[PDB]
Amino acid sequence: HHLILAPMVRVGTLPMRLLALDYGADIVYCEELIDLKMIQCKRVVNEVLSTVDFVAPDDRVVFRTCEREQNRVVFQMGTSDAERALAVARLVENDVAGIDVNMGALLSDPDKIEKILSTLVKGTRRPVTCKIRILPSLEDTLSLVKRIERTGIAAIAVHGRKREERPQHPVSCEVIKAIADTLSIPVIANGGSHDHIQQYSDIEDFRQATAASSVMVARAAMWNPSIFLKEGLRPLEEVMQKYIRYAVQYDNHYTNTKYCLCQMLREQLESPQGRLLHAAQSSREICEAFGLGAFYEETTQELDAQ
Ligand SMILES: Cc1cc2nc3c(=O)[nH]c(=O)nc-3n(C[C@H](O)[C@H](O)[C@H](O)COP(=O)(O)O)c2cc1C
Ligand SMILES: [Cl-]
């Protein structure tokens, strides 16, 4: 039945994840974080923002989660070592609701994949998932997914495109169905934005077009997070202010906030609001551009009071 926010570098930081939950996503994946950064990290409870932060040696917050999403956030790591991957899982397993391993390079070596994943399943008590592209040959694709399954992972997400297949090329619902059918564990359909998904109801269509257990949406949610809302799309302005509010409440860095709003604006980047956003050099300026200066001064004061 599940609507899932797909993992997305830069986009899937905490504000977007909360925003996606508000509009009706059941599960939110975070951006890919690399094991080699995460293993340098320290877990720190931030009583000011009421978040759990994981901080790097240069004092940067690498990953930030919070109570509202603790039963729904899936942590995705990029990794090519089973011992390193377990170490990262151990660091976060208490503050997250699942561990995902990216595979779209790693996809080449099935042995390494098998090692990493079984180490995680035996290693943590959270549902281990993974996300793959499809192989150029269907026989191999089917072989791959079956090896991956017996490692005891909770589910698998299939981006129905082959490595080095450009996004313009249609997603192959047919292979995702093949996969979904063969395996005993849930399959998560992925790859259907723009082509199949422009409106909420399109998601269940895609579910059926692929026989999958659920649907994982990226670009469509990046363009308008209210794509998870069954009642229909919200006006982009309303969504963007909602986004900014979260971003200010959780002290998001303004370059990240700006990046996400640009992905939302797109064509409308040439409106005066868009030009103001492009030009912003701080969160204050981002809020000004959307009539949220009041909100910014008010929320900043409560936060800087520790
Ligand atoms: C901005 C952006 C960043 C992405 N970052 C990641 C990432 O960190 N991890 C990942 O597994 N896939 C990443 N993806 C790919 C998506 O998760 C997904 O495979 C694909 O976009 C699904 O197709 P769809 O957009 O049609 O739903 C990214 C996609 C976009 C648009
Ligand atoms: Cl309305």
Author numbering: 12 to 115, 129 to 330
Structure paper excerpt:
HsDus2dusD crystallized in the space group I222 with one molecule in the asymmetric unit.The structure confirmed the monomeric state of the domain observed by gel filtration. The structure of HsDus2dusD is organized into two distinct sub-domains. The N-terminal region consists of a α8/β11 TIM barrel fold, in which a central barrel composed of eight parallel beta strands is surrounded by 8 alpha helices. As expected for flavoenzymes with α/β barrels, a well-defined electron density, assigned to the redox FMN cofactor, lies at the center of the β barrel structure close to the C-terminal end of barrel-forming strands with the re-face of the isoalloxazine ring oriented towards the barrel. Remarkably, the TIM barrel core diverges from the classical α8/β8 fold because three additional β strands inserted between Lys53 and Thr76 form a new antiparallel β sheet (β3−β5), a feature not observed in the other Dus structures. The helical sub-domain is formed by a 5-helix bundle that caps the top of the FMN binding site, while it is composed of four helices in the other known Dus structures. A consequence of this additional helix is that the C-terminus borne by helix α13 points toward the opposite direction compared to the other Dus, thereby orienting the dsRDB domain. Remarkably, this domain displays a less positively charged surface of the helical sub-domain of HsDus2 compared to its known Dus counterparts, which could explain why HsDus2dusD exhibit a weak tRNA binding. In contrast to other structurally characterized Dus proteins, in which the isoalloxazine ring is planar, the electron density of the FMN cofactor in HsDus2dusD revealed a ‘butterfly’ bending at the N(5)–N(10) hinge, with the concave side corresponding to the re-face of the ring. Since the oxidized flavin ring system is widely described to be planar, while bending along the N(5)–N(10) axis occurs only upon reduction of the isoalloxazine ring, the FMN cofactor of HsDus2dusD was likely reduced by the X-ray beam during data collection.
The genes encoding dihydrouridine synthases (Dus) have been identified in yeast Saccharomyces cerevisiae and Escherichia coli. These enzymes are homologous to dihydroorotate dehydrogenases and dihydropyrimidine dehydrogenases and they use a flavin mononucleotide (FMN) to catalyze hydride transfer from NAD(P)H to the uridine substrate. The human enzyme conserves the ‘bona fide’ Dus domain that spans the first 330 amino acids, while a presumably unstructured linker (residues 331–367) connects the latter to an unprecedented double-stranded RNA binding domain (dsRBD) formed by residues 368 to 433. Using biochemical analysis and structural characterization, we here show that HsDus2 uses a unique strategy for binding and modifying its tRNA substrate. In contrast to other Dus proteins, HsDus2 has a dsRBD, which is the primary tRNA binding site.
